[PDB]
Ligand binder design. Structure first.
Ligand SMILES: O=c1ccn([C@@H]2O[C@H](COP(=O)(O)O)[C@@H](O)[C@H]2O)c(=O)[nH]1
Lengths: 115, 112
């Protein structure tokens, strides 16, 4: 089972259902099960990386691709007033799934500080 | 149009610089929202993430790798939050794309 057995690894392999927005060879975008904004989705690599603090230098293009796919999906979902992208790292970040992912939140005014 | 982050990149006004290379700059946020709060910005003037090009992919990823290395160097061993704001709903404050890195306290949910 390539990609590991976190819930996101299993979503990648279609073993657990998700509401998928976009998929390519490098990543997957799907709606968050506990949305914190009217639109709230995740962009995740298909390659398993546990957290950003252990990403390798050669992962740069992949991490950037998450953001490019994030902004394209946001446009496709009509978030024309904007949105916020978030990565939660470790305990102080509140990370709860150790498979790297980018949150994209919009459809309402986001506030400052960002948590 | 130029921004205050352009002035910072050009060293025209001061900032507490953490790291620099040929394509990005990391510096402490002047209005910190956590005990550690810094920015990583590209030297290329991309005004907002919504207009970033496909060719910008590795540059954007570079901001994140530089961010995580700076976070480690600044002792954020318990973790942190990375943020990119887009547009008015995103609360984007400067139209030069920038990665926020916040830590040194528990970050909360929702993220604004
Ligand atoms: O089956 C799952 C499990 C988690 N999540 C979402 O993944 C995120 C995990 O938390 P964090 O690691 O991003 O803090 C949360 O927003 C949570 O709702 C899902 O969408 N589906």
């Amino acid at each position: 089972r390539p990609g590991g057995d976190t819930i996101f690894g299993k979503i990648i392999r279609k073993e657990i259902p998700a509401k998928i927005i976009f998929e390519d060879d490098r990543c997957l975008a799907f709606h968050d099960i506990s949305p914190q904004a009217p639109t709230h989705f995740l962009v995740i690599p298909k390659k398993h990386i546990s957290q950003i603090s252990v990403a390798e230098d050669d992962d740069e293009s992949l991490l950037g691709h998450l953001m490019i796919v994030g902004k394209k999906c946001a446009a496709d979902l009509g978030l024309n007033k904007g949105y916020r992208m978030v990565v939660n790292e470790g305990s102080d970040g509140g990370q709860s799934v150790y498979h790297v992912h980018l949150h994209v939140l919009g459809g309402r005014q986001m506030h400052w500080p960002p948590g």
